[PDB]
Amino acid sequence: MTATNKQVILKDYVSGFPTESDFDFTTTTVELRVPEGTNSVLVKNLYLSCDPYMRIRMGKQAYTPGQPIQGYGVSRIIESGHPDYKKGDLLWGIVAWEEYSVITPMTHAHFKIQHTDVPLSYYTGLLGMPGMTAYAGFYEVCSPKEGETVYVSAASGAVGQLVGQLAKMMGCYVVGSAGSKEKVDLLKTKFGFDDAFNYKEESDLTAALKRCFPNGIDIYFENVGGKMLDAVLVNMNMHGRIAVCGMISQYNLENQEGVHNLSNIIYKRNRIQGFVVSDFYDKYSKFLEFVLPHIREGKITYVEDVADGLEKAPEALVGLFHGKNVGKQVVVVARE
Amino acid sequence: MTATNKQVILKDYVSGFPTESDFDFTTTTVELRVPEGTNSVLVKNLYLSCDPYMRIRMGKPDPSTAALAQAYTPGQPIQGYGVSRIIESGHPDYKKGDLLWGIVAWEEYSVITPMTHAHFKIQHTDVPLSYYTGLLGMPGMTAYAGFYEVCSPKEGETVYVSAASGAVGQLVGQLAKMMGCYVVGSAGSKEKVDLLKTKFGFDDAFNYKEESDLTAALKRCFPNGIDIYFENVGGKMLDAVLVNMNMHGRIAVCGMISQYNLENQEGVHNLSNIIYKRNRIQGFVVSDFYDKYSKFLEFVLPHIREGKITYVEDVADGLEKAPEALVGLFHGKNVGKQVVVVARE
Ligand SMILES: NC(=O)c1ccc[n+]([C@@H]2O[C@H](COP(=O)([O-])OP(=O)(O)OC[C@H]3O[C@@H](n4cnc5c(N)ncnc54)[C@H](OP(=O)(O)O)[C@@H]3O)[C@@H](O)[C@H]2O)c1
Ligand SMILES: NC(=O)c1ccc[n+]([C@@H]2O[C@H](COP(=O)([O-])OP(=O)(O)OC[C@H]3O[C@@H](n4cnc5c(N)ncnc54)[C@H](OP(=O)(O)O)[C@@H]3O)[C@@H](O)[C@H]2O)c1
Numbered sequence: 136m137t138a139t140n141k142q143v144i145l146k147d148y149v150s151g152f153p154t155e156s157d158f159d160f161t162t163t164t165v166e167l168r169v170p171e172g173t174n175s176v177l178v179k180n181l182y183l184s185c186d187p188y189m190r191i192r193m194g195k196q197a198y199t200p201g202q203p204i205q206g207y208g209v210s211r212i213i214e215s216g217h218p219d220y221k222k223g224d225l226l227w228g229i230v231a232w233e234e235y236s237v238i239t240p241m242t243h244a245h246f247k248i249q250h251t252d253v254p255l256s257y258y259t260g261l262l263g264m265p266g267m268t269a270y271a272g273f274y275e276v277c278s279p280k281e282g283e284t285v286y287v288s289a290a291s292g293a294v295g296q297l298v299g300q301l302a303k304m305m306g307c308y309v310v311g312s313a314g315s316k317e318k319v320d321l322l323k324t325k326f327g328f329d330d331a332f333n334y335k336e337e338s339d340l341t342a343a344l345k346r347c348f349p350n351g352i353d354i355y356f357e358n359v360g361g362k363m364l365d366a367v368l369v370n371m372n373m374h375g376r377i378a379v380c381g382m383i384s385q386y387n388l389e390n391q392e393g394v395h396n397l398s399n400i401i402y403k404r405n406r407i408q409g410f411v412v413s414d415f416y417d418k419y420s421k422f423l424e425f426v427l428p429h430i431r432e433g434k435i436t437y438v439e440d441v442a443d444g445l446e447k448a449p450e451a452l453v454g455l456f457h458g459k460n461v462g463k464q465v466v467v468v469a470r471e
Numbered sequence: 472m473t474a475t476n477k478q479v480i481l482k483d484y485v486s487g488f489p490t491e492s493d494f495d496f497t498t499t500t501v502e503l504r505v506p507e508g509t510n511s512v513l514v515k516n517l518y519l520s521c522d523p524y525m526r527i528r529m530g531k532p533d534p535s536t537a538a539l540a541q542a543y544t545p546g547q548p549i550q551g552y553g554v555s556r557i558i559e560s561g562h563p564d565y566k567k568g569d570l571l572w573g574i575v576a577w578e579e580y581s582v583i584t585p586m587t588h589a590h591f592k593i594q595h596t597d598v599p600l601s602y603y604t605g606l607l608g609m610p611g612m613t614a615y616a617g618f619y620e621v622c623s624p625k626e627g628e629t630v631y632v633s634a635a636s637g638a639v640g641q642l643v644g645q646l647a648k649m650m651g652c653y654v655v656g657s658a659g660s661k662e663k664v665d666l667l668k669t670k671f672g673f674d675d676a677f678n679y680k681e682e683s684d685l686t687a688a689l690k691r692c693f694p695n696g697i698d699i700y701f702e703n704v705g706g707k708m709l710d711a712v713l714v715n716m717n718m719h720g721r722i723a724v725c726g727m728i729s730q731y732n733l734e735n736q737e738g739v740h741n742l743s744n745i746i747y748k749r750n751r752i753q754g755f756v757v758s759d760f761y762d763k764y765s766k767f768l769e770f771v772l773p774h775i776r777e778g779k780i781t782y783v784e785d786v787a788d789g790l791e792k793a794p795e796a797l798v799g800l801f802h803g804k805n806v807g808k809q810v811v812v813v814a815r816e
């Protein structure tokens with residue numbers, strides 16, 4: 136075939152919060168050939184991830200103006216110049232926001248799917264690059280014992296909803312926070328945490344956390360920052376671990392919020408350790424063969440926001456920095 | 472037999488900086504009796520220390536601070552670390568001539584109870600007794616504990632040490648030079664920086680005071696960035712270090728002395744940097760590691776006696792000066808460790 140390839144470019148660099156008018160749709164024409172240099176695969180992009188690191192990549196290796204925005208996503212091989220991928224099987228990894236991409240598959244960037252007995256939308260999230268951040272970030276970096284109390288921020292979403300599920304499986308008391316009432320209702324209905332609150336309904340964030348924890352916070356999984364780290368630093372305990380995954384409060388800000396209560400690290404004998412998921416990708420098969428017995432069984436679940444089409448995909452990345460995503464924000468580019 | 476026992480009392484709680492005025496003086500009568508309490512010894516305090524925790528045992532009851540603190544009671548005297556000779560006992564491990572270092576009150580004579588990770592015996596006299604406040608005591612143990620067990624160091628790695636000519640800081644940077652390491656310091660005066668470059672053998676050093684852009688100072692000093700940080704300061708300083716740090720690089724949070732004296736506690740912005748740099752900010756109290764005080768003393772006393780560790784001290788005479796001495800530590804007119812002699816020998 137010689138099909139028309141619909142692409143989402145970034146026009147120019149973003150300074151603050153993203154708008155849909157920082158990105159434009161352009162078209163190329165892909166010849167469905169055995170591809171551009173005999174080391175490569177040609178894929179058809181099935182599902183795409185709208186995940187929040189993309190804002191830090193939108194700043195002045197960083198993205199280049201007039202070219203597609205790179206992201207993770209699930210893809211079907213249409214043709215190959217690589218040895219261990221034939222035509223008709225599945226990968227996940229860094230693809231361009233296209234309908235059809237030619238990529239070179241390097242090991243801990245791009246991964247083959249062997250288990251299609253679960254949704255292939257989950258391989259942008261749960262069994263993808265959000266879910267590995269929750270395995271890796273809770274079991275190494277947070278270093279947990281049972282009974283110990285876990286706090287998850289942006290609990291609602293991607294990374295956050297597996298951290299909490301893995302904790303009320305270990306024997307921990309887990310509290311989450313989220314933006315709207317419907318996002319906060321899932322934490323107790325579906326994912327079945329012990330408590331939850333709406334941080335947007337809290338005028339009282341330090342007092343909110345003193346309410347939820349009569350016994351304090353041993354573990355924190357930091358996805359948010361600033362004002363929430365200040366509050367958590369007060370409500371902590373003796374040898375209290377903080378796992379700094381993200382800072383979504385800060386990405387979208389030029390002159391970014393200051394943390395005041397870092398003196399409660401000497402006193403309260405705290406470890407704040409920052410990680411990157413990429414480092415733990417050697418433990419992906421170890422993760423898959425732990426969590427697929429549990430997803431297949433209904434111990435571990437997932438909520439996804441579905442955004443059908445490449446058309447509503449500027450719409451969908453913009454939407455994270457406000458939290459329109461009721462769970463993990465997937466784009467469907469192709470259904471079959 | 473009676474003693475005329477002078478004391479240093481605290482008036483009421485501190486907000487902001489201490490002054491010589493937030494402290495007061497009394498005299499008591501102490502009987503030199505063979506004391507019935509339980510496992511209690513009547514000591515005679517010889518030397519005392521001016522240590523900066525004493526500020527967040529001087530402020531109002533807060534739950535955070537109350538992990539190392541108990542908070543000082545507004546009437547009855549200031550507690551702290553210092554050396555002490557036993558002038559009659561009610562213990563097994565201690566008798567009528569033995570010396571102790573530990574947490575005594577700021578008086579001439581005290582009835583204390585020895586506890587294992589509080590009060591420690593001296594069964595080594597070859598070295599100064601004033602040193603069991605600092606080097607052979609609690610500042611030197613912090614330096615051993617927090618550099619070898621929290622900064623998790625390997626040879627050749629680049630170390631930045633803050634409040635570097637004070638008690639804990641000067642030892643860190645020698646313990647670091649005693650491995651492969653590249654040690655740069657920071658201190659207040661010119662007299663202080665000329666002890667880092669010469670006496671305590673640091674590779675380079677500066678005056679944070681005489682530096683306008685602090686990142687520019689640390690990008691001059693380390694071209695290839697910081698691997699280990701011994702954090703004795705906070706604020707401005709911790710922000711500069713986070714942009715000057717290497718990947719999988721560690722930070723040991725000993726103290727944060729810039730903050731203690733502030734009501735409105737200063738913000739560290741770029742703690743964002745620890746994701747993309749895989750960095751570890753780790754806090755400790757020394758209290759947790761006093762089980763390795765035997766394994767400390769078996770190490771350092773071979774290195775002082777051979778001339779591989781160097782140390783300065785700032786002695787002031789009598790309890791009279793012990794207000795003036797704890798105050799001027801927050802400004803920094805202590806050169807090394809601030810000792811207060813109550814009685815010598
Ligand atoms: N270090 C790593 O290894 C690694 C890897 C991948 C991703 N990440 C990062 O970690 C986070 C992970 O995904 P996720 O689980 O958070 O999924 P998500 O729910 O899809 O992400 C968006 C969430 O951020 C919250 N939010 C947005 N603006 C905010 C603001 N201004 N202040 C406070 N909260 C705000 C919203 O939740 P509420 O209002 O609902 O609470 C919203 O649901 C991101 O920051 C991401 O960049 C880190
Ligand atoms: N268990 C523990 O973790 C533990 C135990 C002992 C001590 N500590 C802590 O570690 C720190 C110092 O240890 P040390 O034994 O070396 O004490 P020290 O001998 O009292 O050192 C005093 C230093 O304070 C500095 N200073 C004062 N105000 C300052 C300010 N506003 N900004 C920056 N620096 C300032 C001075 O330097 P300048 O001349 O440069 O101004 C001076 O050299 C304290 O924060 C203390 O509480 C912690």
Ligand SMILES: CCCCC[C@@H](O)/C=C/C=O
Pocket residue numbers: 188229264380381411412413746
């Ligand atoms: C090339 C895409 C970058 C992938 C690393 C990402 O997981 C890091 C998230 C940090 O916030």
Ligand SMILES: CCCCC[C@@H](O)/C=C/C=O
Pocket residue numbers: 401523524539540574609725726756757758
């Ligand atoms: C009971 C006295 C407290 C002793 C702990 C002290 O070394 C901590 C210093 C923190 O800045």
